[PDB]
Design a binder for this molecule. Structure first.
Ligand SMILES: Nc1ncnc2c1ncn2[C@@H]1O[C@@H](COP(=O)(O)OP(=O)(O)NP(=O)(O)O)[C@H](O)[C@H]1O
Lengths: 249, 42
């Protein structure tokens, strides 16, 4: 089993909900990775103890080039240490902040890698539920990485308080795609009530600069009735995705 | 202070290697669920 002494702490990568993430290098292989350091005290004082249990069992089973890898984990008196795959190009939200929005081929690539990894998860009976830029990292050549397992991103059924299946991820994928190309989420409002009314009516207002190709994919993904939302397979095969995706494999 | 292996230049060359010629992950770090059950909070 591992300890903190097995690793060379190089420098931090940024704070989070429960602790700091450090750039680390295990001395045995001299292999680089990211150490997520969580604090038991707060983990307990916020009841988030249940989820952490699941997010680990998951990555004891999940292995996908587009899902952030947890190599292992340990725990001293005060912390749980997560051995996570290093994402060299940082997080995606900041890239979206920089560029304001991504071009068609950038987003189309992200969508194929996302649809892909999501499918993999579904086969294993795993739903993500919450897919937004903040939960996405980038590889060495920029390939997308679902990292950790909000009003604007909630499907109608989630808002309305109905039971939900895997298809919430299809909805979310559409919302995500939209934000990629536009820069804002599709149902943005200055009140939680107005957003609520916009999600459930699927009040979709597409800006002038958006390609008909993209508009279509988004429209099919963002449908009220869950069983109508375009399956992951249909995403990767969508004309606009095929015509724009540029994934490294 | 920040180590040299963690400094941009020789850090970039180190990433290239783990990318293009990836070390066997689940071999070196085998036993997945090794650090016990839910007895991890005390
Ligand atoms: N594998 C990684 N590689 C490089 N930088 C990383 C990595 N993981 C995190 N960062 C850096 O740390 C991330 C922030 O910490 P977290 O989001 O990991 O911690 P949470 O508990 O998830 N907090 P919540 O997302 O729930 O609000 C930054 O996105 C990134 O700069």
């Amino acid at each position: 089993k591992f300890t903190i002494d097995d690793f060379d702490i190089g420098r931090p990568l940024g704070k989070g909900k429960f602790g700091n993430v450090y750039l680390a290098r295990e001395k045995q292989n001299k292999f680089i990775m990211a150490l997520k350091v969580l604090f038991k005290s707060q983990l307990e004082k916020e009841g988030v103890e249940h989820q952490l249990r699941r997010e680990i069992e998951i990555q004891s089973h999940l292995r996908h080039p587009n899902i952030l890898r947890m190599y292992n984990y340990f725990h001293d008196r005060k912390r749980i240490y997560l051995m996570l795959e290093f994402a060299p190009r940082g997080e995606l939200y900041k890239e979206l902040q920089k560029h304001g929005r991504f071009d068609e081929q950038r987003s189309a690539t992200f969508m194929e890698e996302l649809a892909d990894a999501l499918h993999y998860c579904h086969e294993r009976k795993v739903i993500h539920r919450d897919i937004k830029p903040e939960n996405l990292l980038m590889g060495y050549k920029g390939e997308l990485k679902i990292a950790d397992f909000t009003l604007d991103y909630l499907p109608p059924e989630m808002i309305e308080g109905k039971t939900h299946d895997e298809k919430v991820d299809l909805w979310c994928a559409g919302v995500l795609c939209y934000e990629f190309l536009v820069g804002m989420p599709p149902f943005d409002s200055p009140s939680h009530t107005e957003t609520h009314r916009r999600i459930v009516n699927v009040d979709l207002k597409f800006p002038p600069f958006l390609s008909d190709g993209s508009k279509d994919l988004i429209s099919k993904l963002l449908r009220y009735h869950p069983p109508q939302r375009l399956p992951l397979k249909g995403v990767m095969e969508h004309p606009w995705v095929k015509a724009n995706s540029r994934r490294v494999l | 202070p920040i180590p040299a292996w963690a400094s941009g230049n020789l850090l970039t060359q180190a990433i290239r290697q783990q990318y293009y010629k990836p070390i066997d992950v689940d071999r070196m770090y085998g036993t997945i669920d090794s650090p016990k059950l839910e007895e991890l909070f005390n």
